[PDB]
Ligand binder design. Structure first.
Ligand code: HEM
Ligand code: HEM
Ligand SMILES: [Cu+2]
Ligand SMILES: [Cu+2]
Lengths: 145, 142
């Protein structure tokens, strides 16, 4: 549960909320298409890919709106954990989805996807990823026995 | 564990479930909708879940003699229940609706010894599900 959210990360993530209000669906859909074509093993995980795309778009927006208080997203984090565990999402998938999410941001935001903004979102992603993946491992261990 | 008599009756129910499980599951959802409106919050995709429960009833009866072939399906049920917020106190409510759906779909075949066998079979599965959901709930608190 180690990683953290620096002051600069929070400021830049907070500032992208206007772009996410307009483009989070484009970012989420583009992210999933890059994942579909770069890592075909993962397509077996998505029962309803269209529905998940709009859920992730909302989560990105909500997460950016609450980057100063991540604990206010406890219920939504719970949903993500149990959805992932239901589908068999694994710890090693998280680098792949970041790779596709980085390039989704680079594509949709065009010039506004500066390297500082991408580094802020990488840290915000790594925080959320480390929290989701560790709680999922715990849930897996409980259902094994 | 389940008595020999209720396992013979669950086995005898497989023909009814291969033809009517959808009707039983749909009627059971429609009854739950009208009798306990607080639960409608829990269902995001009611149509899809009706068909998933129908297939789970059929699979449960078809392997009533070793519920371990349902290990993957039980996992899915447990994680979907946790994700939706299903509680131990909900299981009596869905039994009353499943019993009345069996009564309605099986008609005269839904005698009281058949319904008693399904009460025992449901209670076994509900116990297995709800205890695993409590363990999952406890870890989400950490
Ligand atoms: C920080 C990283 C991630 C975030 C923020 C995120 C976000 C979400 C959200 C909000 C949902 C919908 C949950 C719901 O409300 O039902 C979801 C579901 C899903 N995600 Fe992700 N996710 C992440 C990582 C991943 C990874 C690494 C994979 C690997 C393939 C993945 C694949 C899936 C699948 C298959 C589902 C649907 C599972 C189900 O509904 O049963 N996600 N995710
Ligand atoms: C022995 C009892 C039960 C059985 C056999 C059963 C069966 C199932 C199955 C097969 C699913 C879908 C699994 C999947 O998503 O792949 C499901 C989900 C669900 N069940 Fe039940 N269930 C039981 C008890 C209950 C109870 C008591 C409630 C209380 C309202 C309930 C409400 C729900 C809801 C809301 C979902 C959807 C969860 C989601 O989609 O995230 N279930 N159940
Ligand atoms: Cu769409
Ligand atoms: Cu139907």
């Amino acid at each position: 549960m180690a990683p953290t959210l620096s002051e600069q990360t929070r400021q830049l993530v907070r500032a992208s909320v206007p772009a996410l209000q307009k483009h989070s669906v484009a970012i989420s859909a583009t992210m999933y298409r890059l994942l579909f074509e770069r890592y075909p093993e993962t397509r077996s995980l998505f029962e309803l890919p269209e529905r998940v795309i709009h859920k992730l778009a909302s989560a990105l927006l909500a997460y950016a709106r609450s980057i100063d208080n991540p604990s206010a997203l406890q219920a939504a984090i719970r949903r993500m954990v149990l959805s992932h565990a239901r589908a068999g999402v694994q710890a090693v998938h998280y680098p792949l989805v970041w790779e596709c999410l980085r390039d989704a941001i680079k594509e949709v935001l065009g010039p506004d996807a500066t390297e500082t903004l991408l580094q802020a979102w990488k840290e915000a992603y790594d925080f959320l990823a480390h929290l989701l993946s560790t709680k999922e491992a715990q849930v897996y261990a409980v259902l094994a026995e």
